[PDB]
């Protein structure tokens, strides 16, 4: 009924065979399919959720799965694919907030039935995104503010704002959180109302 | 057909998707094998002139709109079904003053789940897929949003209130002069998630955010 997985530096063809053994689905794999994969889920996944993870891994490495009666065809169109369990926030709400941190070479997908996220990126950027998810995770909804920077640079702005909050220089902002969205040079500011409203003012003061 | 404008324009209405694929092959020189299951009627429109690479982006948006994708199968490119109303138009909307990426989160609440929305940053254009009457309505929203100097925004997830009521009260109060301090700010309802998107200059936006919180008490 449920499965976990810990596959490290395995041929993508082994991962396909392991999905066939788990799900019972048989695949006809195009000769051009190739690559090394690392796939991890410490969370228990249902048969349907294992299939969603399979699609995310295929998409991560540039492969499409096409219906073909009974069997399905795998065809072309180091990264680890990890399943991250979210405890309190709805996963579909966190997706847009985490997408900025995922590079264009990566993958990000929701698994709403397990309240989990699937991410593909280098192992070190996943661990950094895991900490962001852990800080975001909460029962209440995330109201937020977006600031499109005109003069400053978001990775610098995010570091200054984080440093000021950690050192006690951002009085009133304690508890607020900032997510840098480097693709569009914008900041996403979260947190409880008073703290969030103050961090928006500090961020705005920085882009003058 | 694609009409020279090397740039082109296009205004294809109610054509077989297979005709649209053949036209893309004639312009791009790319040869495709179309899986027997690929079917449908398409309307594709660009009054803006598109380069060769932008015509290819429009092609991908049309394929994705109708549930198709391009794969490599047996030494050739194959268009296949990937894992909605009968009449969908795919229109390119050029944006004049604002960077297109900044308008995308403000117009996404208006694109339904069957639709499509993609950026074409090299032409500063948006590709939208929807019913022709719905696209015209979104084109007016883009024209109004594009005249604004800032596209910074605040999001409020309403826990108690109904989204459409809150938006109407806030708009009425701003139009009647009752939202002191928030004049100049604007509201976009996002029903799918029962949330408000508040825009405007910083202080007015900060005041409309406070006013919006009083309606969800
Ligand atoms: Mg095999």
Bridge partners for A29 per DSSP: A74
- Helices first, then strands: H and E counts in chain B: 6, 12
CATH of B149-217, one of 1.10.10.10, 3.30.1370.120, 3.10.105.10, 1.50.10.20: 3.30.1370.120
Contact assignment for B72 to A32 by CB distance below 8 Å: yes
d(CA A202, CA B52): 44
Rounded CA Rg of chain B: 21
1.10.3720.10, 3.40.1160.10, 3.40.50.2300, 3.30.1370.120: which CATH number matches A1-138?
A: 3.30.1370.120
* Contact by Cβ (8 Å): B100, B125: yes
Resolution in A: 2.0
Kindly indicate whether the domain formed by A140-208 is annotated with CATH number 3.40.50.300.
no
- The answer to whether the beta carbons of residues A121 and A102 sit under 8 Å apart is yes
Contacts 24+ apart (CB under 8 A), A59-65: A59/A107, A59/A109, A60/A106, A60/A107, A60/A120, A61/A12, A61/A35, A61/A37, A63/A12, A63/A33, A64/B69, A64/B71, A64/B80, A64/B82, A65/A27, A65/B83
Contacts of B102 (CB under 8 A, 6+ apart): A148, A184, B151
Q: Pairing relation of β-strands B2-4 and B8-16?
A: antiparallel
Q: How many CB atoms lie within 10 A of CB B34?
A: 16
User: Nearest C-alpha of chain B: how many angstroms from A70?
Assistant: 14
The CA-based diameter of chain B, rounded to the nearest angstrom, is 67
Chain A CA closest to residue B203: A201
**Surface-to-core class of residue B182, CB atoms within 10 Å of its CB (0-12 exposed, 13-18 middle, 19+ buried):** buried
Which residues, listed in sequence order, are joined to residue B155 by a DSSP beta bridge?
A: A144, B197
**Residues A76, B71: C-beta atoms closer than 8 Å:** yes
Distance of alpha carbon B196 from alpha carbon B54, whole angstroms: 33
Last residue before each gap in chain B (C to N over 2.5 A): 5, 83
φ and ψ of A207, to 5 deg: -105, 50
Look at residues B96, B208, B101 and name the one whose alpha carbon lies nearest to residue B151. Answer: B101
Residue A89 φ/ψ, nearest 5 degrees: -70, 145
Size of interface A-B (CB pairs under 8 A): 61
In chain B, ranges of CATH 3.30.1370.120 domains: 1-147, 149-217
**List of E strands, chain B:** 2-4, 8-16, 32-34, 41-50, 68-72, 77-81, 89-94, 116-120, 125-130, 153-157, 186-190, 195-199
- In angstroms, the CA B25 to CA B23 distance is 5
β pairing state of B68-72 and B8-16: unpaired
What is the Cα gyration radius of chain A? 20
Give the tokens for residue A48.
């349907």
Which residue in A33, A37, A50 sits closest to A81, CA to CA?
Answer: A37
Instruction: With beta carbons less than 8 A apart as the criterion, state whether A118 and A111 touch.
Output: yes
Question: CATH 3.30.1370.120: which residues of chain A?
Answer: 1-138, 140-208
Q: Give dist(CA B156, CA B212) in Å, integer.
A: 8
Burial class (CB in 10 A: 0-12, 13-18, 19+), B200: buried
Phi, psi for A80 (deg, rounded to 5): -105, 145
Residue A141: list chain B partners with CB under 8 A: 157, 159, 195
Q: How far apart are CA A108 and CA A98, in angstroms?
A: 8
Most B CBs within 10 Å: which of A51, A55, A58, A64, as the mutation test of the B interface?
A64
CATH number of B1-147: 3.30.1370.120
CB nearest A141 (choices: B101, B154, B159): B159
- Residues B169, B172, B177, B180, CA torsion sign: positive
| Whole-angstrom distance, CA of residue B59 vs CA of residue B50 | 12
CA distance A190 to A143: 7
- Taking the CA of residue B71 and the nearest CA in chain A, the distance in Å comes to 4
Query: Cβ distance A81 to A57 under 8 Å?
Result: yes
Partnered with residue B15 across adjacent β-strands are B42
For residue A199, give how far its alpha carbon lies from the nearest alpha carbon of chain B (Å). 13
Q: How far is CA A109 from its chain centroid?
A: 7
Chain A residues within 8 angstroms (CB to CB) of chain B: 30, 32, 55, 64-67, 73, 75-77, 93, 141-148, 183-184, 193, 197, 200, 204
């Amino acid at each position: 009924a449920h499965w976990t997985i810990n596959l490290k530096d395995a041929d993508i063809r082994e991962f396909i065979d392991q999905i066939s053994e788990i799900t019972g689905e048989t695949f006809v794999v195009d000769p051009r399919v190739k690559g090394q994969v690392s796939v991890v889920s410490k969370a228990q996944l249902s048969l349907s959720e294992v299939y969603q993870l399979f699609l995310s891994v295929m998409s991560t490495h540039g492969f499409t799965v096409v219906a073909q009666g009974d069997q399905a065809r795998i065809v072309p169109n180091r990264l680890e694919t990890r399943v991250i369990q979210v405890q309190q926030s709805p996963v579909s709400e966190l997706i847009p907030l985490i997408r900025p941190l995922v590079p264009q070479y990566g993958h990000l997908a929701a698994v709403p039935s397990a309240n989990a996220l699937i991410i593909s990126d280098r192992s070190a950027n996943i661990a950094r995104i895991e900490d962001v998810i852990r800080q975001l995770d909460q029962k209440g909804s995330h109201d937020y503010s977006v600031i499109n920077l005109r003069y400053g640079w978001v990775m610098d702005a995010a570091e200054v704002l984080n440093n000021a909050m950690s050192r006690g220089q951002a009085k009133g902002a304690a508890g607020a959180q900032v997510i840098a969205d480097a693709r569009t040079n914008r900041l996403i500011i979260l947190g409880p109302p008073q703290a969030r409203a103050k961090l928006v003012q500090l961020a705005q003061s920085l882009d003058t």
